[PDB]
Structures are given as C-alpha cells and as structure tokens.
Write an enzyme that holds these catalytic residues in place. Structure first.
Site, PDB file in Angstrom:
ATOM      1  N   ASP A 192       1.185   5.160   0.880  1.00 27.13           N
ATOM      2  CA  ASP A 192       0.586   5.578   2.146  1.00 27.13           C
ATOM      3  C   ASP A 192       0.146   4.346   2.934  1.00 27.13           C
ATOM      4  O   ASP A 192      -0.965   3.841   2.748  1.00 27.13           O
ATOM      5  CB  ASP A 192      -0.584   6.528   1.897  1.00 27.13           C
ATOM      6  N   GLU A 407       5.519   3.667  -6.962  1.00 30.11           N
ATOM      7  CA  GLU A 407       4.597   4.584  -6.296  1.00 30.11           C
ATOM      8  C   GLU A 407       5.388   5.813  -5.865  1.00 30.11           C
ATOM      9  O   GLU A 407       6.184   5.732  -4.927  1.00 30.11           O
ATOM     10  CB  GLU A 407       3.946   3.900  -5.102  1.00 30.11           C
ATOM     11  N   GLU A 452      -0.179   6.168  -8.875  1.00 29.01           N
ATOM     12  CA  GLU A 452       0.037   7.567  -8.503  1.00 29.01           C
ATOM     13  C   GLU A 452       1.488   7.996  -8.719  1.00 29.01           C
ATOM     14  O   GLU A 452       2.190   8.414  -7.797  1.00 29.01           O
ATOM     15  CB  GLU A 452      -0.394   7.809  -7.056  1.00 29.01           C
ATOM     16  N   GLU A 528     -10.040   2.546  -8.216  1.00 28.54           N
ATOM     17  CA  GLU A 528     -10.392   2.887  -6.843  1.00 28.54           C
ATOM     18  C   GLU A 528     -11.685   3.688  -6.847  1.00 28.54           C
ATOM     19  O   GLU A 528     -11.791   4.688  -7.562  1.00 28.54           O
ATOM     20  CB  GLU A 528      -9.277   3.691  -6.162  1.00 28.54           C
ATOM     21  N   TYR A 529     -12.661   3.248  -6.055  1.00 29.75           N
ATOM     22  CA  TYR A 529     -13.901   3.994  -5.886  1.00 29.75           C
ATOM     23  C   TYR A 529     -14.548   3.582  -4.572  1.00 29.75           C
ATOM     24  O   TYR A 529     -14.199   2.555  -3.984  1.00 29.75           O
ATOM     25  CB  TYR A 529     -14.864   3.780  -7.062  1.00 29.75           C
TER      26      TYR A 529
END
Lengths: 982, 173
Positions: A192, A407, A452, A528-529
C-alpha cells in the site's frame, strides 16, 4: 531476427512466475573494483565504477506491443529527455495509483522505453569484464545493447546486473531498456503506497579484471566477555585459477592496521569429494576490539586484496566492519550480552518531491532527525533499501531490520501464493538475493521475511534457508498470527497493551498476555504499532510503561516515519511525545533527591549535563546545573540545594533536563535529550478579592438581559438563553454567541475505515451521527436574572434533543461582579445510553484577531488527555499561527490541556480547562476535504472545554480510545472566569 | 505439612541445617502416608514461611518419588524456587511490582512472562480480609479470567470472611 521486439515479447516473460530473470548475474555485496589498496581503504571514488545517471531519452506506450521495431536501432523523433533516476509517473504520463488473475496481468500494460547513448574507452574492452548495474527498475524490464537483446529482470528493489563485454563496441554505444509497469512480480509487491514505475535507482557500469573477487563475507566471533574477537573472512574468486594468486585481508582502525592475513586459494575440506578450490577463508585475531552499537558505532575498515604471490595487485575490495553479537538467549534479544530495547520506526523510501528516488542528503537528514528524537532502530518497510542507507546506519548508529520484497496482502486467502510451491522459486529469489547483498552490514541485526503474506510452507522453507546461511542474525516474520514457526520473535502488528483482540485463527492478544501463553518463550517486538495517521499517538505512554516493566517486551517500530514528520520533514506534535517516552534517562523524585537512571547499555554519560529549575506559576525561582556521571544502566543520586519556599499562592514546579554541551555527529551543541517535571508544593489561595464599590446594573426587556458596568456591558438573549454580545466601550467583542459544544471535527481515528459506501457502525463518528450529536438543537428550559448585593446572577438551563430524545442538559450560572469579572459555572448531564460526547465545553467566535497567544498551562505544543506526557507546565507565548496544526485532512487540532490561565488580546480566561484557538471553526474543519481549501474566518474561534475525549492511536480502523479517556461519568462540572484588562 | 519457622532471623536457619532434616522429614512423610488416598487432596504443600533450604529440596523430591500423582507447591525463598511445581506467591499484586531484595514480589502478570518461567501461578494467599477490606478483589478475577496460566488463588482467613459465629462479612458477597 530473434533480437526483434516480436520475438522477444512473444513468450511474455512478465506473465510467467517461473521466469524472474534472464542472463542476470549473481547477487553480491557492493563492488567498486579498486586497483589500489590505499584508495580502497579510504573509500575514494573508483574509476572502474562509472555512473550512467543523467539525461536519457524516454518514450511512453500504452502496451508493450505498441513499441515500434525501429526503437531498437535509433532514438525516436518524439522522445523527450528525462533524468533517468526518476519515476515516469512524476512526469505526467499515466496517473499514479495509491491502491484478480494470479499469474496474469492486464493487457493494457503501460511501457516506458528508456534509451541512452554513451561512450566507452578502449581500455575497458581490451581486457576485463564490463557489466551494467540497474539498482532499481520497477516491475520488469528488457535490456538491449546496440540492438542486441541482453536479458530480463524483476524484483524492483534489488540490483540487476548483466555482462556487457560481448555487446559493447569501441566508441559510441546505445542502450535500450523497455520497462513494463506490471508483471507477475507485481503480485509479490502488492503493498500500500504510490505504485509508480521506471528506473528509480542508479545505473552504473563496473569494470572487473579477468580474474576477480566474485564474493566475500565476514563473520565475527567473540569470547565470553568480548575481550577477544576473531574476524573470519571467506573470499570467493571468479575466473582462471592460478597457483600464484593470493588474497590478503587487512583490518584498519583509522590509519593504523590492527590485523592482517594472507593465504593462497583452496578452502578447507568440505565433504568426501573435497573443498572449494576458488575459495579461501582468512582468520584475523583482534585483541580488545571496539564493539559496534547504536550508541557507539565503532567501525573498522576491512580491505580485501587479490594479488599475485610476487606482490602485484589485481583488484581490491573493501567494506566497513562492526564487531557485535546478536542472539536470543532465554527469550531475550541480546546485543553484545545486553538486552536491547528497540526505539524503532518504520520508514518507507519517499523523497520530499522526487517520489521514490532516494539521495544521500535526504537519508542523512532522516537519520539525524531520528537520533535527535531518541530513535535507535529503523525497519526497512517491506523492501530492501538503497545501498547507501545501510552504510549510513553503520556510521551513525541505527539498528536495521532488512525486509524481503514479498507482500501479498490482496490475496483472498492471503497465503494463496505463499502456500503454493509454484511460487516458491519467485519468493526464494527475493529472500536470497537480499541476504547475499546486505549480510556484511553491522547495522542489519534482524532479517524479515516480508509483510502481510499469510503463512505458507514457503515461509518456513525460506526461514530455514536464512538460519543455515547466516546464523548470526535472528529471522522475524509477521503473518499467520505473528507467532508462527517462521519467526524467532513474536512481532504483532498493532497489538494493544491490555486489551485482547481475538480474531478467528489470527488473534491479536494483548502483548502482556501474549508473552505468558502456554509454551511461549520468545521475545516480543512490535513490527508495527502506534499508528500516527493525523492527530494520533494517544496512549503512547502506555506502551512504554509496558516496555520498561516487562523484560521480554523489547520495544517496537512506530509506523510511518514519513507520518511522524511531514513530507518536507517538518515534525508532527506527536514526535515530541515519542522523543519523551523514548528517553535514555529516567527520573525519580523523592523529597529533595533526584534519582537519574541511565538506559544506555554501553556508553557512559560523558556528554551529559543536568539543568534543574524551580518555578512558581511560570515565574523562575531557582536553577542549577549538575554534571551527569552515570554508568550504563546505573543510577546517580542528585541532591538538590535548599529549594525556594515562596509564600505567594500557586504551585511549585521542578523541571529537569539533560543537555549535551558538545556537538556530536548527529546533534549540535546544546541538544536536549531528556526532561521531566514534577509538582513540588502548592499554596492554596485564601485571600479575598478587593471590596469593589460599584454594582453592575441590570436592565430587562422582552428580548434580552443587559448588564452594564462602567464601559463594559453584557447582553443575554432571552429567546436563545446564551450570552449574545459583550461591549467594551462601543466595540463589540463577539461575532457568534457563546454556546455549549459537545462535538469536535472528527479525527482520523474517529472516522476509521467508514467510507460513504462501506459504513462502519462501530466508528466513533458514525455513532455520534446516528445519535444526533451533530444535529442536536438546543432548547431553552429556563432563564432568570437576579440582582445580588454586589453582583448580577444569570441562570440558564438548556436541553439538547434529537428526535424526541434528550441527549445533554446544561445548567449554567453567570455571576457578573462589580470588579468586572465574569464567573461561569457549567453543570452538564449526559444520557447514559447515548455514545460518550467528544467534548464538554463552550465555543464562541471572538471579533478580535491578535498576533500572540499567551497561556499558563501544559506544553508549547498541542497536547491531548492521552498525549500530554511530553508537555510541560509553564508560561507559553506563541503566535496564533503556531496554535494551529496543519494536518493534511482538516480535523480538531491545536488543543492545549491543563491550562489555568489563557490570554488573548484584552481577554483573560482563568480556571482548569483545555482550549484550542484558531481562525477555522469546527464546522469548517468537518466539511473541508484538504487543508489547502481552508479559508480563515472573520474573527477568532475559541473552544474552551472543561473535559475532552482522548484521541486514538493503537490503530486507525478500529475504536482505540481507552475507557479512562472516554467521557463516561454522566455528570460534569467546570468553572470559568472571564475578565478584561482592568 | 506442619512446618513453619517464620520467626527465625535468616528464616532458613533450620531448613538449611541438615541437623533439622530428620525432624522436618517426619512432618512431611507421615502426612503423605496418612492422606494419600483422599481424592479431594490434589496438591501437597511443604509448609509455610520457612525460607528455602536444602531440606525443602530433599523433601520435595521425596514426595515426587513416593506420590507422583499430585503436584508439590511451596511458598518460601521467593515462591518460585526449585522446591515448587507452582508459582505460589503470598499477596502478589495484579499490576504493581514489589521488588524486595532477594525475594521480589512481582506482579502476577509480569511474573508469568519472566525469562525461563513456564509454571502456572496460583496464589497461596491473597486478598487479606482483615476488617473492612477486600478492595480491588475484582482486579484479581479479571486477571484470572484473561490469563490462562493465572489459575486462581486462596483468599486468606476463611474465619476472616466470616465471624466466629459464622456470620458473614459484607466482603463475602
């Protein structure tokens, strides 16, 4: 012929997952082919490595079959000129895209035809091998040289190298590169971002000798206490093997050589048939090596020389060597024997104005900004980066997670390709060629298998390949639940501190609970956070409280560096919160004693000075400076002198800050790295106001209540029940009546993924709209005015109803005394069944526009109930422009919490409130799509809230405001005093 | 087992002394020999508040050999020694750590995830019910439900939760 476009394009190599390259050379660490050992040691430019960056000819076509055959011979007449390291979408050819048939791509495949005419010296062609390196070409491309087909390539994010020796002619040459926008490789690069295409990285020519160094990698081994190290270098050569060939590896610290080794070729016995005749391993012993870390990036220079036994040099290669050990022991990730705490951030390669083209100046600017905000790690977000990025991270000090360019989040099972063995060859190339390129960089401490893509058998196979080839680094992978067998580290995306999210087959446990699941021993680092989209990063302090307390919670990577900064690298207000929560010095106050604990693991505080200050309501009273002498992970007790004890009313505040007096490579002299504030002692005010002799005079009509005192005068609308106007002299002070406000312009966290088509009923903004909070109409219940002995009393009661349902009730009291002051007490009832309101306060549009905003309260920067830890209580003076945060999508912004006094023009507001002040109303912020369409209004819009809802930040698609920051009490009270310059 | 030496100044002065091993072994062995046939007995306890000595380890292994059908628990020496199959802290808090020297009382959530820790946690004593007390009881049972390896605990002093005449306290509700 077979070099023609018709023959080359007939097999459709870009629609075949089994064809990822044709005639491509093997992957290797970067090579410069120095012909001098001293030049290699000092990293001087090499004349054997020539850059083809510059002006090329470009032609765009809707499909590959639309390219004429004549393009292979001569440049087109309508072809324009571009700078080759660029994306052609930035030049306006086809629309860039931010957003299935698994093997096939659409027939309308935009095609960019690049061409360059260049010269080649005869010295390169008489002897040696000449190759061309394409560092990055988006999707797939075909290469021609003087009309002859050379090869084919994919995997946009890794270099593609081809041998051009048989194709180059003495004199002038022409290169023709046919870049396709989509290929079968696009299914593995389906992330993305702005898609974009072209030759977005460097193109260069490298000349190697006939006998050359083909590959080399270094390994460092240590004893128990890291006092002795062994540097093993394995060198592989290509070409003709001679008995007089030698390889020398020398280690340099600055200009002094510290180790050296020479050996002929022929490695150790491998198995029954023997060993490698073209390989040699050199072992170099280093005594008391200077270890590499992010805190102290000690680097050596390893020079690999290929030379004859007599002593004549053939070729020299060099790389920077850092001495460090990374391993997981007893569920902890250790660097040089110490447990790491990752202050990480995700970073995409995004140029401020050139799209996806990265240059050195932008990389150095990014690294400096990260280290100045207490970041020590960066995650290469979903693809290998520019080669110079890893070199800069070695020199400045940054832990790097290197990620393979895999990905596939768009697949409906999401593992449809990663569980398919037919796609294993495609994915293996993306993993193996990354490891072969970057395995020598000390900054790279963790490999990542991608992002992902579910969990398939291909992930397990590629995980075990890395462990076999490079056992010196852990392998991590989020996918299939972030705790599969293909990861050494539990690396969830956007897992919450305390709340569990039990999704089917892929639950997101709270990080505290995740650690203690039956049979779980691995460390947890969040890949990721803390989604930083818009006005966000609420609850960031919750994560770092958990990071400190739990040993196996070893930090994480904040999503989207650029994000935490704008495109022009202007910082967001949330960047200050990240810097404060990531400080390397923790502070504890006990009486007159400050305890300073160092969070550094290796360095001593030798560039640190503690400045302390005591102020009373923003008025300094005492200050002092104490040098810091703290061992790594040690404590220094600092006894403050006898602090001032003012007898004037107010709260005493103690502020400490750590200042670096000397400039470093990444910071300038006077850099503030850590701070903390405390409340010392409060003297409650008991003195009465002066006995004013005057009494405000009340006039009553059928339309309004008018209170007059001297030159000041107030007017209350009896129909509306709100204060409508105030006059100082004959000048009106208000453009909009002072009314209760229960809504805010929705934040990105308030909206979620609730589009106008796919509505999200659980989103905060959708619940507020369904409950009628934005459409509730105030109804006056009662409005009375009474004259006191020294004041005038105004009492009002309003009800906010939506479709026969009372949402809020506000009871307000106005007390205008003879001194001119105006006390406003508000009591609000909120229905328990309606969703909790975003705010409880007042708003008005002041007629006056002023240049400076002065307030006594928290922080210079904007802060919110769950993002106020970095803010400090003091007297702040800012221009009105700095009171507005220019978010790309307009929303509620500019709030300052914990404010006791606010001054704007002649008006002063006192109490215990939060405020934001700007030229844009909350209504305009809600209806304006982009900030460039915002227009200033006639006056100044002031929002004073007694209470305000927290902002989200755990993710941006689901409600993430914690219960302790929601306005769920049901009944609320706050007081405000409004006075003037008198 | 009827072993309790909390008044000793090192508190393991007798349980680390081999001369007191015969005395303590009799208290452990004769209890097991008497009650090993009862289905209700599911856990053996080595005693209470006696530090941690070598005698505890020896008696722990004796029970495991004689009766492997029940786990053995023991609070003492930090409630997570080698003489217990279950982490059984006394009055450990849900979220707040109490790092006492050489015997820290970690929060039960943090205690589970310490490096190398795999055992279940059951509090042998928690929620002191002395007087008007048992505030924050809901915090423990929220944690019990959420964490699989937090498997409950024993509230201190049944009688306490009731008066001597067995009249219930308000905290019993």
């Amino acid at each position: 012929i077979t070099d023609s476009l018709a023959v080359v394009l007939q097999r459709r190599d870009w629609e075949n997952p089994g064809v990822t390259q044709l005639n491509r050379l093997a992957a290797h660490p970067p090579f410069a082919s120095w012909r001098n050992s001293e030049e290699a040691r000092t990293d001087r430019p090499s004349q054997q490595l020539r850059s083809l960056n510059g002006e090329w000819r470009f032609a765009w076509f809707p499909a590959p079959e639309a390219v004429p055959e004549s393009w292979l011979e001569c440049d087109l007449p309508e072809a324009d000129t571009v700078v080759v390291p660029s994306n052609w979408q930035m030049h306006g050819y086809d629309a860039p895209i931010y957003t299935v048939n698994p093997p096939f791509v659409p027939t309308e495949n935009p095609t960019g035809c690049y061409s360059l005419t260049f010269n080649v010296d005869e010295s390169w062609l008489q002897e040696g091998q000449t190759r061309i390196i394409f560092d990055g070409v988006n999707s797939a491309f075909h290469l021609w040289c003087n009309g002859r087909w050379v090869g084919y390539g994919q995997d946009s994010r890794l270099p593609s190298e081809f041998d051009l020796s048989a194709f180059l002619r003495a004199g002038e040459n022409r290169l023709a590169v046919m870049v396709l926008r989509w290929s079968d490789g696009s299914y593995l690069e389906d992330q993305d971002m702005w898609r974009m295409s072209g030759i977005f990285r460097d193109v260069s020519l490298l000349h190697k000798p006939t006998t050359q160094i083909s590959d080399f990698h270094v390994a460092t081994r240590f004893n128990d206490d890291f006092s002795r190290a062994v540097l093993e270098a394995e060198v592989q050569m290509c070409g003709e093997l001679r008995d007089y060939l030698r390889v020398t590896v020398s280690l340099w610290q600055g200009e002094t050589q510290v180790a050296s080794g020479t050996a002929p070729f022929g490695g150790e016995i491998i198995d029954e048939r023997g060993g490698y005749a073209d390989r040699v391993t050199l072992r170099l012993n280093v005594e008391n090596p200077k270890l590499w870390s992010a805190e102290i990036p000690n680097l050596y220079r390893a020079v690999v020389e290929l030379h004859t036994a007599d002593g004549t040099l053939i070729e020299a290669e060099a790389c920077d060597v850092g001495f460090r050990e990374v391993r997981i022991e007893n569920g902890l990730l250790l660097l040089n024997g110490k447990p790491l705490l990752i202050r990480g951030v995700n970073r995409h390669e995004h140029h401020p104005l050139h799209g996806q083209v990265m240059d050195e100046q932008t990389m150095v600017q990014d690294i400096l900004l990260m280290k100045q905000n207490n970041f020590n790690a960066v995650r290469c977000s979903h693809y290998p980066n520019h080669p110079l990025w890893y070199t800069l991270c070695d020199r400045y000090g940054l832990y790097v997670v290197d990620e393979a360019n895999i990905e596939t989040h768009g697949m409906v099972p999401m593992n449809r390709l990663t569980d398919d063995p037919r796609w294993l060859p495609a994915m293996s190339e993306r993993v193996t060629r990354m490891v072969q390129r970057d395995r020598n960089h000390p900054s790279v401490i963790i490999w990542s298998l991608g992002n992902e893509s579910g969990h398939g058998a291909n992930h397990d196979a590629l995980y075990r390949w890395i462990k076999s080839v490079d056992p010196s680094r852990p392998v991590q992978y989020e996918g299939g639940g972030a705790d599969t067998t293909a990861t050494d580290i539990i690396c969830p995306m956007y897992a919450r501190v305390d709340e569990d999210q039990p999704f089917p087959a892929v639950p997101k446990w709270s990080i505290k609970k995740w650690l203690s699941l039956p049979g779980e021993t691995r460390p947890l680092i969040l890949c990721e956070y803390a989604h930083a989209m818009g006005n966000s990063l609420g609850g960031f302090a919750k994560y770092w409280q958990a990071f400190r307390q739990y040993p196996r919670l070893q930090g994480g990577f904040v999503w989207d560096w650029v994000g935490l900064v704008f495109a022009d690298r202007t910082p967001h207000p949330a960047l200050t919160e990240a810097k404060h929560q990531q400080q390397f010095f923790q502070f504890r106050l006990s009486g007159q004693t400050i305890e300073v604990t160092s969070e550094y693991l290796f360095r001593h505080s030798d560039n640190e000075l503690l400045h302390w200050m005591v102020a009373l309501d923003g008025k300094p009273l005492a200050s002092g400076e104490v040098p810091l002498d703290v061992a790594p992970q040690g404590k220094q007790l600092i006894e403050l002198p006898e602090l001032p004890q003012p007898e004037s009313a107010g709260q005493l505040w103690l502020t400490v800050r750590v200042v670096q007096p000397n400039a470093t490579a990444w910071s300038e002299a006077g850099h503030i790295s850590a701070w903390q504030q405390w409340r010392l002692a409060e003297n409650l005010s008991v003195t009465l106001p002066a006995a004013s002799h005057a009494i405000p005079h009340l006039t009553t009509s059928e339309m309004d209540f008018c209170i007059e005192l001297g030159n000041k005068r107030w007017q209350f609308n009896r129909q509306s029940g709100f204060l409508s106007q105030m006059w100082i002299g004959d000048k009106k002070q208000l453009l909009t009546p002072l009314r209760d406000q229960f809504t805010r312009a929705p934040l990105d966290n308030d909206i979620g993924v609730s589009e106008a088509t796919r509505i999200d009923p659980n989103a905060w903004v959708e619940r507020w709209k369904a409950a009628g909070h934005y459409q509730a109409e105030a109804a006056l219940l009662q409005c009375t005015a009474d004259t006191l002995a020294d004041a005038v009393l105004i009492t009002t009661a309003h009800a906010w109803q939506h479709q026969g349902k009372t949402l809020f009730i506000s009871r307000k009291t106005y007390r205008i005394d003879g001194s001119g002051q105006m006390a406003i007490t508000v009591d609000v009832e909120v229905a328990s069944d309606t969703p909790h309101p975003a705010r409880i306060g007042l708003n008005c549009q002041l007629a006056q526009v002023a240049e400076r905003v002065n307030w006594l309260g928290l922080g210079p920067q904007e802060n919110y109930p769950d993002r106020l830890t970095a803010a400090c209580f003091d007297r702040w003076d800012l221009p009105l422009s700095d009171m507005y945060t220019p978010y790309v999508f307009p929303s509620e912004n500019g709030l300052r919490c914990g404010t006791r006094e606010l001054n704007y023009g002649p008006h002063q507001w006192r109490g215990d409130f939060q405020f934001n002040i700007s030229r844009y109303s909350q209504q305009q912020l809600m209806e304006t799509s982009h900030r460039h369409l915002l227009h200033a209004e006639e006056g100044t819009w002031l929002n004073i809230d007694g209470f305000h809802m927290g902002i989200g930040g755990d993710d941006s698609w689901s409600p993430s405001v914690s219960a302790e920051f929601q306005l769920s009490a049901g009944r609320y009270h706050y007081q405000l005093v409004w006075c003037q310059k008198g």
